[PDB]
């Protein structure tokens, strides 16, 4: 159950400054919704979300560095109320 996002394919590898952040834990998410937009020194990546529930955690923003697969945001996925 639940899910844990992960840094996209910015191209480089680790220590990559994010470019977009739209998650504060609590917002709904579907199986197709841009979560963020990252970039390093080759290209600008992003994540179209991959779940269907609510976020619990959040490890990303605008100004910090990240690395491919570093646990960004966790969700409930296929959750009910």
- Those residues whose C-beta lies under 8 Å from the C-beta of residue 81, and which sit 6 or more positions away, are none
SS3 45: strand
Return d(Cα 72, Cα 50) in angstroms, integer.
12
Burial of 60 (0-12, 13-18, 19+ CB in 10 A): buried
Q: Which domain holds residue 6?
A: 1-81
Torsion of Cα atoms, 11 then 14 then 20 then 21, to 10°? 140
Q: Domain count of the chain?
A: 1
**How far is Cα of residue 20 from the mean position of the Cα atoms in its chain?**
9
- Give the CATH number, domain containing residue 47: 2.40.50.100
**Determination technique for this entry:** NMR
């Amino acid at each position: 159950a639940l899910v844990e996002l992960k840094v996209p394919d910015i191209g480089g590898h680790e220590n990559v400054d994010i470019i977009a952040v739209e998650v504060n834990v609590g917002d709904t998410i579907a199986v197709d919704d841009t979560l963020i937009t990252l970039e390093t020194d080759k290209a600008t990546m992003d994540v179209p979300a991959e779940v269907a529930g609510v976020v619990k955690e959040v490890k990303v923003k605008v100004g910090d560095k990240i690395s491919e697969g570093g646990l960004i945001v966790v969700v409930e996925a296929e959750g009910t109320a």
